[PDB]
Ligand binder design. Structure first.
Ligand SMILES: [Cl-]
Lengths: 187, 16, 96
């Protein structure tokens, strides 16, 4: 103003994972079309922000990072995310280094994980060739092995962008209502 | 054929 | 008297329009009972582990005011960490 309560952002930040790995064109373009849609569908109610720092590292020797992303920079980015959610705008992270929900499981971010799922590995393969194949297939396969109810908040398995967008919007409109009762008053 | 409609869907998504 | 209850209900109403101070995700469940001595009867917020709460302010050492992040749920009293701990201790003692 053992602990029973963990402090989390006032609006759970939306993080997209799948169909495959970020940094490659199939995943990057498929997620971008979704971010583009959110930007206009939730205009005035959403903040979409790039996170390049490796927020997977968020949680008597001093703890340090062995990559270019420091624990101080990560902490700065965690505080920026909490602060962006403080007035209850929807928050969406374009988080470069998160390709799997287990990478945020131990943070205090409590994300809404949106799984952009290609149901068939054969469809994913052909997609990639239509444009480093094996790292992409393994990442998609890892996603497909997660227990869906506990790992993901939304699964977009629709093959039409229009239908994936409306399903995600429906979810985010309901979250909006849950967080804004009338009684309270790639990118 | 379901896989073929899948692929066309995702190709159109990527194009968008 | 029992205008203590009046002041507690009045603090609840005043909170409805206040900002969210912070949010918490729960790591334990709380299933409210009348014997928990809630400042206004029937206004305790129960929850399960991994639920989300929006917190407005602190009423006293045993109770916060806030709500479950769920459509149709409204402001009420949320047990403080100390209150959760004292319920667990009182239960452990009673069970020995
Ligand atoms: Cl050290």
């Amino acid at each position: 103003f053992t602990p029973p309560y963990d402090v989390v952002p006032s609006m759970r930040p939306v993080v997209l994972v799948g169909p495959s790995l970020k940094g490659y064109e199939v995943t990057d373009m498929m997620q971008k079309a979704l971010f583009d849609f959110l930007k206009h569908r939730f205009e005035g109610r959403i903040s979409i922000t790039r996170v390049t720092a490796d927020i997977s590292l968020a949680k008597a020797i001093i703890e340090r990072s062995n990559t270019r992303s420091s624990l101080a920079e990560v902490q700065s980015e965690i505080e920026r995310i909490f602060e962006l959610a403080r007035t209850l705008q929807l928050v969406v992270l374009d988080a470069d280094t998160i390709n799997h929900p287990a990478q945020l499981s131990k943070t205090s971010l409590a994300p809404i994980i949106v799984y952009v799922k290609i149901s068939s590995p054969k469809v994913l393969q052909r997609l990639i060739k239509s444009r480093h194949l094996n790292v992409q297939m393994v990442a998609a396969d890892k996603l497909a092995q997660c227990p869906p109810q506990e790992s993901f908040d939304v699964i977009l398995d629709e093959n039409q962008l229009e239908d994936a967008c409306e399903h995600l919007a429906d979810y985010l409109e309901a979250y909006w209502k849950a967080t804004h009762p009338p009684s309270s008053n790639r990118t | 054929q379901q896989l073929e409609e899948d692929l066309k869907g995702y190709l159109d998504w990527i194009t968008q | 008297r029992r205008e203590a209850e009046r002041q507690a209900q009045a603090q609840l109403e005043k909170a409805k329009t206040k900002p969210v101070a912070f949010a918490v995700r729960t790591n334990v469940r709380y299933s409210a009972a009348q014997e928990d001595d809630v400042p206004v009867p029937g206004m305790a917020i129960s929850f399960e582990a991994k639920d989300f709460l929006h917190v407005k302010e602190k009423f006293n050492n045993d109770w916060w005011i806030g709500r479950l992040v769920k459509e149709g749920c409204e402001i009420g009293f949320i047990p403080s960490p100390v209150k959760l701990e004292n319920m667990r201790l009182q239960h452990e003692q009673r069970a020995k």
